[model samples]
Target: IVGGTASVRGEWPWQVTLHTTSPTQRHLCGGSIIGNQWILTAAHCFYGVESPKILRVYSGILNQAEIAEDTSFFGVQEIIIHDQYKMAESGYDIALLKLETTVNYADSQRPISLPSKGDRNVIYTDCWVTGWGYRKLRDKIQNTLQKAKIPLVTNEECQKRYRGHKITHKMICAGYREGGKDACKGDSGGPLSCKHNEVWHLVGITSWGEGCAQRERPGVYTNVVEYVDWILEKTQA
Candidate 1:
């Protein structure tokens, strides 16, 4: 069984700060260190940008931006968008960021664990979503990363709930019926992790929602289980 809230709140915290020239404003989203140079996030998050100067990787922060002395700041070299992702179903909402350099794993900058083959069943019901995204209209960027416990909304339930939206095997729903309590805009591309084997395994990547944290419309995430092979092949290829 996966560990509960106590073990996950701050376990694997890394972030991507997107600096866009067009928007001229900074945007932040949560991410996880999956390997020495690969950080996983939603494909939709970096869909238009083509360079790392616009996106910076920030990690090793405590509850706030206070230095934990364990954070790593790395520039991204390449953006690997999942080939399956499309605007219709939001498929393959996942992506990999190849860092300009490798991060030396340590107490604070260590990589989060990925699900092993056939481990999907292990994370059936519970999971946690964490981020520093928008919380309210004028109240955005919580400044400190926050987390909430959410339950996995089954596939059949999703189809029935989000009619007309193509819910594929590469996605998972986790949140309350009145979705005000779920992840929001800035949280896009964040992590929905399941506790397993005494460590947090990223089971989902925050992607889309009906309306930022609305009720009856919980946030949808990229299903990592179904895309592990694709991710491996793309990363190695």
Candidate 2:
């Protein structure tokens, strides 16, 4: 998360540090707790990656060091990507990772509520995003989780910004047109949540963009409001 602030440990209890066992435990992407065991993330994160054995989800940790310091982590039980998901730049970039073990609500871990099915996201304007992007890419920051407040761009405005860039209704554009604040490289699959009536609801999942923090190229996210059925049905059976 470039141009974002270091978040407190319990500030974003649902945030999780997703890693790949690519022979070694390495920081790969960011995801969020959707249920006791299911993790909500972008499908692009696990591209060509089959077998949940290679993935691990470290929840309730604000600092990256906790990946080793504690055991508040879970091995992925299953990786579920939307079948209609065509490409990274396309729509349906959402996915869910079922944890090998169910996590109980404690300390800095809890599932975020999802938006109601068929709820139009037009009214959900302002939102917050959190993740642990590669700090070295721009600044060698600390291992703490990063967060930023951004506005949900309107469809017409976003389409104007991304002329002919295929701004589908299933996609969400959030960030300043002047740029600077955005979810960069490794921030994909992070949560793009919004607060309503005192409760935070999972509204979006960080997806793709033109570049990290660029003018007229704000961070893009997969609209979770458009995928309620796919998300809930996949875990039903």
Candidate 3:
């Protein structure tokens, strides 16, 4: 995230780093562990990429450059992108990855709690966005995970910045109205978590933004609660 500080290791244990590789190169995207074998991420991360074989998921680490003793790596058994997802637009950007094996929970690894389906209208005024995304626009990606606190932006205020488009029920917006804190490249699919009763709940999935932390242009995310039923169906199917 832009204008953020380095995160403490295991501070956000459910956070996962996604990678796409060729024999000689790799790319990074952010994600979260939603269950023992399910990973929540952005569908756009896999857009135009037909095979899940080249993908990998890394958990329990803050530093992407270094492999810690407790880090766990998993293979993707399949990728389940939203049926109506169209990469050309920002809507329905969420996706799920079924891991080949289940994660063994530990201090450095665990599943994040999903918001109850009954409360789809819950507004998370205070929340955090964490990732290893770029520190600035067109800048080099960060090596360590970074975090920034961003308040929920009302759809009315958010729409004022981008006219001709209605903020649908499937999307959520967050950031500072004055700018300077937001998710950037490589942060796509990461968690936008809100705390309730002292426990953190996954609220949004990092989706898109006009640019890195611009005034009046907050980061837009997939409303996680809106898809609770879809998620349950897919995970259970």
Return the clash pairs for model 3, or none: none
lDDT of 3 by residue, 37-92 (tens): 99999998886578888888898978877644354579899999999998614588
TM-score per model over all chains: 0.84, 0.93, 0.94
The local lDDT score (0 to 100) that residue 201 gets in candidate 3 is 93
Candidate 1, residue 193: how far the Cα is off, in Å? 0.9
Cα displacement (angstroms), candidate 2, residue 122, comes to: 6.1
The C-alpha local distance difference test score for the whole of candidate 1 amounts to 0.70
**Candidate 1 local lDDT, 1-237, one digit each (tens):** 011222233355544343334455355566778888888888778766767676767666544454223544577888888776665255777888888898877666677777877786785445778777666544566555666788888877877778978888878887777665677777777888777766678888888777665667767888888888877887784
State the C-alpha lDDT per candidate: 0.70, 0.82, 0.86
TM-score of 1: 0.84
Q: How many steric overlaps are in each model, in order?
A: 6, 0, 0
Where in model 2 is the C-alpha error above 4 Å?
A: 69-72, 135-142
For model 2, name the residue pairs that clash.
none
Instruction: Give the CA lDDT, 0 to 100, for residue 44 in model 1.
Output: 79
